[PDB]
Amino acid sequence: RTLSRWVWISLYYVAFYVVMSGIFALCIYVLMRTIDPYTPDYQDQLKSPGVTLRPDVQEGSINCTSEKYFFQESFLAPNHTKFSCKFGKPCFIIKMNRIVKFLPGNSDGPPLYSLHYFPYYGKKAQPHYSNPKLLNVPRNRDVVIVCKILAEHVSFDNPHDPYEGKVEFKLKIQK
């Protein structure tokens, strides 16, 4: 608490916090420079793709068929946007979490993907890219269902991410 000196405080921080924000941003901008615009430096975190579903818990493009992987080339800009292939008793849809340059490998409880889509090239490379029923007899009861995917590339973490390559939902159609 002073007087006729606050100007020495205000002006100080104005050109101090300024120098700091200027340095902070200075470091973020250099960091940003050393990263690809098409691919992350680390894919490890997403190593094993997880499986997610719909149920809240095409002009141009190319026609394709169930077949092997299709390489659009390298992940570069020299070529324009890489073309993408076309595509009671509730219905749930499942999809595989998109992961750049990842090729999936493939080449009784209670009563109740095509390789031609991979590898995914990423949003920047492929903007409008498109990634690829429980008529059960029982009703009025909670049924635990686990839909999972198999492959050498796919791994599950039962103790952790129950989503990693698998599902776990309890449908109940009370009628």
Binding site: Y17, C27, I35, P40, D41, Q45, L46, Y163
Partner: protein, 986 residues
């Protein structure tokens, strides 16, 4: 002060007491009175603090801060009970942590104080004792407690005075009022009334005072608590401690912290409401922000810091009854010291000798640190043998190893001083007194008190008998004729005779007691070798003797005292001598110790030199003054304040204990911190009232020791100096420590702030913050306590409680505003590097948290278009917390280094010399590295291994911190009155 009935005719006295002077009282009455009031004994210490006292340690002022903090956290937790909350690991944990700290710190501090008390208990050795009473004409020894009021009592040599008595009759009785009154030498007691003040009068004996010699009868005036010492003892328990200066400083500190806490809590509460968060959320944010501002670890770091210093003091044999009592000394402006027992040794000894019409000062010091006179002269030899030979003084069996001065001796006061002196200078008196066999001696007579003794000759030259005698200078002057010089005799001439007289008056005026020593050879022809002379007739010519010389004596200050006082004065501390002794001696000792510098004249000195009435001289011209207690009784508050203000060097002489209290209080009236050092009971009221009392371990009495806040077991006065020094360095280091810890709050709090504002995934977690505040920073924070003096602290003046503050605006201005900010940015930079690298560019991170935090959304698009499940991205968030943690550590490295010095550059002091700080950063980095790399960490603490590159991102920021504060440390040194020092320099 007290009053009494001491001046009364015995007839009047007994008339009032209804007692017989010779017969005493009748058993019936004695028993009746004893049963009426209460036995002769002081009511045991009205303080029996139960173990419940432990609770005391728990409250205090600081522990209260943590208490309220813990309560706040608990309430916050109670509030979050409104919904399903993560707090199970957050708030409840913190609240409990806070309570854990207060209780643990309390237990530690309590144990310390307890250990000291136990040690104290070991010293208590009690003996009931007994008193000799005379009832119905018969003398009977009964338990002292049985003594009643108004009954004749008999005191002998060595017996303690059972209760306050009014001496009716006495025979060469000399009581020792050393501890109660403060009177150094044994005061004789007689039936006649000598002085108005009952304390100085001879007609009264006091409780707890031992009678050195003689015998006396007396009527018991006071019994039990009503006695004088009892009155003093009672008063020495009704005084208040007052808040310690360090305690108030911390109070101000909490005010600042809480102030910032409330401001941000409130401001953000309003801000939150403006955005959209429900009131519930707004409240949880309020509680969150406030609680976050409370440094949990700082309570432990402060307690330990004080403990460490206290431990050092303990090593010096300087014990602190209270933990806070460590810092105080660095705040003392005035020291009221006692004379005898404190400043002095309280032991009498030979002062000056008179040979060849010259005065030669002897070595008065206990340690014999003084200078020895010239022993060569023969006159000295002769006087020595006369002093050595004529005495009843002899060392007791057992005093061989012990130093000749401290060793005990059985004999009179003067004879003891003389014996010790002989034994020291001339050699052993044993063989010497044995040399000359004493045939017949005349002990001091009731009148003229001359003491003579005649021995045979040891020398082979002349076979004449040797006669020796000592006595009062005037009486001996009457009996002496011849005078000896350089080994040759001469008759007495008025010139030299007067020289002797003047010398006598000079030494006598010096305050010392002088004794005339003379000897005479006998005409062997008249007195044959076989002749056996008795005491009956005058066998030796009492007159015509050869007067050798005089021997005086006094008691000196301890060896360490003089230098200690000089240091206290150089420190800027005003030294005031408050003694109940006589002014003549008081002033002399004052000048000796340095309380009264040489060249400084009192009002009397000026009046004396000018030969003008003392009243004429203007007090202003006198810098020093010796104020008699007689005037002190009349003086008013304005009088005392004037005296204290107008005179730099002051000495209060002949001052009663109550008066010592008023003097201390008068010094407090000035608003200055007073420190009192004493020895006896007279200092009990003073030592307790002072901001800090100082007793003497051995030389001090029990009452005063109980009243003292600090005790000196070694009885070294120099310790006081060390004490005052020991109090000021710790203050600066505390600033260092506090500043450091306070700097961490910015990079810790900010992450949660921005989280709420920008809506970005939480950068730093709760567990992480705890590892910084409690895990890593702990060692470095304590290491700073080891910082040494930046400059000569003793040179600088004592800090001002008002102006100077431990934690002031400037400190906050830099821990929170400057350095703290730099760290925060360092942390976030690390955050962005990890995120951007993982696939989440900074720009996209905004407003991502709502989706991010949601456990249900498995498909979360990053910058690349990838889809992240919950655990995946959360893993990134956790691997993002660790790096932020590590980043804090790296920034703390620079902060610790700069925190090391307040003014000086790292160059000068070299923060590296401090080994503990060094091990602090090595252990800190090691631990941080461990938490990140240890195998089970991500499971338990949710801390994941950090990619090596990550470690580097916070590096440049740390360098900025160091380089920045260093230049600041340079600019400050260059421009003392610079604008940086005013703002920065805390």
């Amino acid at each position: 002060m007290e009053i009494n009935d001491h001046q009364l005719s015995v007839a009047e006295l007994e008339q009032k007491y209804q007692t017989s002077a010779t017969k005493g009282l009748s058993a019936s009455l004695a028993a009746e009175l004893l049963l009426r009031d209460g036995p002769n004994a002081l009511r045991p210490p009205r303080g029996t603090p139960e173990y419940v006292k432990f609770a005391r340690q728990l409250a205090g002022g600081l522990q209260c801060l943590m208490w309220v903090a813990a309560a706040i956290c608990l309430i916050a937790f109670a509030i979050q009970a409104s919904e399903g909350d993560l707090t199970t690991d957050d708030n409840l944990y913190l609240a409990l942590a806070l309570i854990a700290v207060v209780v643990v710190t309390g237990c530690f501090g309590y144990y310390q104080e307890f250990k000291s008390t136990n040690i104290i208990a070991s010293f208590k050795n009690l003996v009931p004792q007994q008193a000799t009473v005379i009832r119905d004409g018969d003398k009977f020894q009964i338990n002292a407690d049985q003594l009643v009021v108004g009954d004749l009592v008999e005191m002998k040599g060595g017996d303690r005075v059972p209760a306050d008595i009014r001496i009716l009759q006495a025979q060469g009785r000399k009581v020792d009022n050393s501890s109660l009154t403060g009177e150094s030498e044994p005061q004789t007691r007689s039936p006649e009334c000598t002085h108005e003040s009952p304390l100085e009068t001879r007609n009264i004996a006091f409780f707890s005072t031992m009678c050195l010699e003689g015998t006396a009868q007396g009527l018991v005036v006071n019994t039990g608590d009503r006695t004088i010492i009892g009155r003093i003892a009672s008063l020495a328990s009704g005084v208040e401690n007052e808040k310690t200066p360090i305690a108030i400083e911390i109070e101000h500190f909490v005010d600042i912290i809480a102030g910032l806490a409330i401001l941000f809590g409130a401001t953000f509460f309003i801000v939150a409401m403006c955005i959209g968060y429900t009131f519930l959320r707004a409240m949880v944010f309020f509680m969150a922000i406030v609680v976050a501002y409370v440094p949990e670890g700082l309570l432990a770091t402060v307690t330990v810091c004080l403990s460490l210093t206290a431990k050092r003091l303990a090593s010096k044999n300087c014990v602190v009854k209270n933990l806070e009592a460590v810092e105080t000394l660095g705040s003392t402006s005035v020291i009221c010291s006692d004379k005898t027992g404190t400043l002095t040794q309280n032991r009498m000894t030979v002062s000056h000798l008179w040979f060849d019409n010259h005065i030669h000062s002897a070595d008065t010091t206990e340690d014999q640190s003084g200078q020895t006179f010239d022993q060569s002269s023969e006159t000295w030899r002769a006087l020595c043998r006369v002093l050595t030979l004529c005495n009843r003084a002899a060392f007791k069996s057992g005093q061989d190893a012990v130093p000749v001065p401290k060793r005990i001796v059985i004999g009179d006061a003067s004879e003891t001083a003389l014996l010790k002196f002989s034994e020291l200078t001339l050699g052993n008196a044993m063989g010497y007194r044995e040399r000359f066999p004493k045939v017949c001696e005349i002990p001091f007579n009731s009148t003229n008190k001359f003491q003579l003794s005649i021995h045979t000759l040891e020398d082979p030259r002349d076979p004449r008998h040797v006669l020796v005698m000592k006595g009062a200078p005037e009486r001996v002057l009457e009996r002496c004729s011849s005078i000896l010089i350089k080994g040759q005799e001469l008759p007495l001439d008025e010139q030299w005779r007067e020289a002797f007289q003047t010398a006598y008056l000079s030494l006598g005026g010096l305050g010392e007691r002088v004794l005339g020593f003379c000897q005479l050879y006998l005409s062997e022809k008249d007195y044959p070798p076989g002749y056996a002379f008795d005491v009956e007739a005058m066998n030796f010519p009492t007159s015509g003797l050869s007067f050798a010389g005089l021997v005086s004596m006094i008691d000196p200050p301890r060896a360490t005292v003089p230098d200690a006082v000089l240091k206290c004065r150089t420190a800027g501390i005003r030294v005031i001598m408050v003694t109940g002794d006589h002014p003549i001696t008081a002033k002399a000792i004052a000048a000796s110790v340095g309380i009264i510098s040489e060249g400084s004249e009192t009002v009397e000195d000026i009046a004396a030199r000018l030969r003008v009435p003392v009243d004429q001289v203007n007090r202003k011209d006198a810098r020093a003054c010796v104020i008699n207690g007689m005037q002190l009784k009349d003086m008013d508050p304005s009088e005392l304040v004037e005296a204290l203000r107008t005179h730099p060097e002051m000495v209060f002489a002949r001052t009663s204990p109550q008066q010592k209290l008023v003097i201390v209080e008068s010094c407090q009236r000035l608003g200055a911190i007073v420190a009192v050092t004493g020895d006896g009971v007279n200092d009990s009221p003073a030592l307790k009232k002072a901001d800090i009392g100082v007793a003497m371990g051995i030389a001090g009495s029990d009452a005063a020791k109980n009243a003292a806040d600090m005790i000196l077991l070694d009885d070294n006065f120099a310790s006081i100096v060390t004490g005052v020094e020991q109090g000021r360095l710790i203050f600066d280091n505390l600033k260092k420590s506090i500043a450091y810890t306070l700097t961490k709050n910015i990079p810790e709090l900010t992450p949660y702030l921005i989280y709420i504002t920008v809506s970005v995934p939480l950068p730093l977690g709760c567990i992480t913050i705890l590892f910084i505040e409690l895990c890593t920073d702990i060692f470095p924070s304590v290491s700073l306590a080891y910082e040494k003096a930046e400059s000569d602290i003793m040179h600088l003046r004592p800090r001002n409680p008002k102006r100077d503050r431990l934690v002031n605006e400037p400190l906050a201005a830099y821990s929170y505003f400057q350095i703290g900010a730099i760290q925060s940015f360092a942390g976030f930079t690390d955050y962005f590097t990890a995120m951007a690298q993982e696939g989440w560019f900074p720009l996209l991170c905004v407003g991502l948290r709502p989706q991010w935090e949601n456990h249900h959304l498995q498909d979360l698009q990053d910058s690349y278009g990838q889809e992240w499940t919950f655990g995946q991205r959360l893993y990134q968030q956790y691997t993002c917390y660790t790096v932020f943690f590590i980043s804090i550590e790296m920034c703390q490295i620079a902060d610790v280094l700069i925190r090391k010095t307040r003014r000086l550059s790292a160059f000068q002091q070299g923060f590296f010399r401090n080994r503990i700080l060094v091990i602090a950063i090595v252990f800190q980095v090691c631990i941080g590295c461990f938490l990140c790399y240890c195998p089970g960490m991500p499971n338990i603490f949710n801390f994941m291994p950090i990619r090596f590159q990550w470690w580097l991102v916070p590096m440049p920021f740390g360098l900025l911190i160091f380089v920045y504060d260093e230049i600041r440390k340079l600019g400050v040194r260059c421009c003392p009155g610079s604008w940086w020092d005013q703002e920065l320099y805390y």
